[PDB]
Amino acid sequence: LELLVEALNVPAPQFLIEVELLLPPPDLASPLHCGTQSQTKHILASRCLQTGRAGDAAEHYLDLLALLLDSSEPRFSPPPSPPGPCMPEVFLEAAVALIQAGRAQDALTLCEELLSRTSSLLPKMSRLWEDELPYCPLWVSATHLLQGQA
Amino acid sequence: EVGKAEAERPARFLSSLWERLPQNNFLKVIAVALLQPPLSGEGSQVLVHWLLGNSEVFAAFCRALPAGLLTLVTSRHPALSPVYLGLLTDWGQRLHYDLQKGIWVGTESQDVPWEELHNRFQSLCQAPPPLKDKVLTALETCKAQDGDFEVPGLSIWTDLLLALR
């Protein structure tokens, strides 16, 4: 996988009917489905995390996250696709690695980074004062759960 | 009359009252008694000393009325203030948060519900400055005592102090 990722770093039409034409662009069930660097490097980090190479994992997640967020200038390196996980479930996996590592003052620049960007999206939580109905997406309730373990 | 007679102490008379008559009605009487301007407040000064002597009835006094009545009892006779604050301090500490329902509640049936206690504290606060600072500081010292958290779930007194802004 480590090789593959460097692999996908790297990159003609005849006026003729070639076979490529007639083949279907593949499905997700196919063994020919191969995402972009970003979609994979997430795979490496996931697969690195479920074994218990938290250290390796950490770095890998950071590299994922470096790509995605610094990327105004280069080519669009993209998020992990939506049968794959949402952009904030992925800052959470980044932090759970950074805890297994014991880099807890990194695991808090994470949970600061997240809720900095997403202020607006959050509930203003005045039901707290007015003492089920108002709406809170799991990943905000988590973000405090791992802000804490830190 | 009994004051100028000096035969038996007024305490005995007030105790025989308490024993004999309808108690609920009786207490509202006393409450009004304490705020009546003087007519000849030796009476008022006798009632504060009877009550403070007997804490058990004074527990049902602070229990049995409205908030405004007891707020005015306090601003007029400050010898009552720090015992009644003592009562709330004792009833709040008999609560627990439950996470399912966003509320403190009592174990037992006869334990002040949240709303009752919120009322009574709101009242002590909606008052003269002579009492307000006393009760505010009596809560903040009670909060620090039970961990100075700054979110609910935890310290009943956090709760009150959030609720009062």
- Give yes or no for B103 touching A (CB within 8 A): yes
Cα(B27)–Cα(B39) distance, integer angstroms: 21
CB A40 within 8 A of CB A5: yes
CB contacts, 8 Å: B152 with chain A: 128, 131
CB contact under 8 A, B162 and A127: no
In chain B, which residues have their Cβ closer than 8 Å to the Cβ of A128?
A: 152, 162
Question: Chain B partners of A123 at a C-beta cutoff of 8 Å?
Answer: none
Interface contact B152, partner A, CB < 8 A: yes
Element (H, E) at B137: helix B129-145
Which two three-digit tokens encode residue B141? 């010292």
d(CA B125, CA B135): 7
Instruction: Give the whole-angstrom CA distance, residue A116 versus residue A101.
Output: 24
Contacts of residue B26, Cβ cutoff 8 Å, sequence gap at least 6? B17, B18
| C-alpha distances out from residue B114 to B96, B99, B135, Å | 10, 15, 18
Tokens encoding B31: 């409450």
**Quick check: A128 contacting B, CB < 8 Å?**
yes
Contact B152 A127 (CB under 8 A): no
The answer to whether residues A35 and A81 touch, using CB atoms and an 8 Å cutoff, is: yes
The size of the A-B interface in CB pairs under 8 A is 10
Contact list, A132 vs chain B (CB under 8 Å): 102
Contact A128 B103 (CB under 8 A): no
Backbone angles phi, psi at A29, to 5 degrees: -65, -30
Of A127, A128, A131, which is closest to B103 when you measure between CB atoms?
Answer: A131
Partners of B103 in the β-ladder: B98
Among all residues of chain A, which has the CA nearest to that of B114? A131
Nearest alpha carbon to residue B120 among B51, B74, B56: B74
- How many CA within 13 A on the CB side of residue A26? 9
Which H/E stretch holds residue B96?
A: strand B95-98
Do B162 and A129 make contact, defined as CB atoms within 8 angstroms? yes
* Minimal C-alpha gap between B162 and chain A (Å): 7
Our CA-based measurement puts residue B86 at a distance from the nearest CA of chain A, in whole angstroms, of 24
Give the Cα separation of A111 and A143 in Å (integer): 6
Tell me the two tokens of residue B74: 């306090």
B22 touches chain A (CB under 8 A): no
Residue pair A117/A110 in contact by the 8 Å Cβ criterion = no
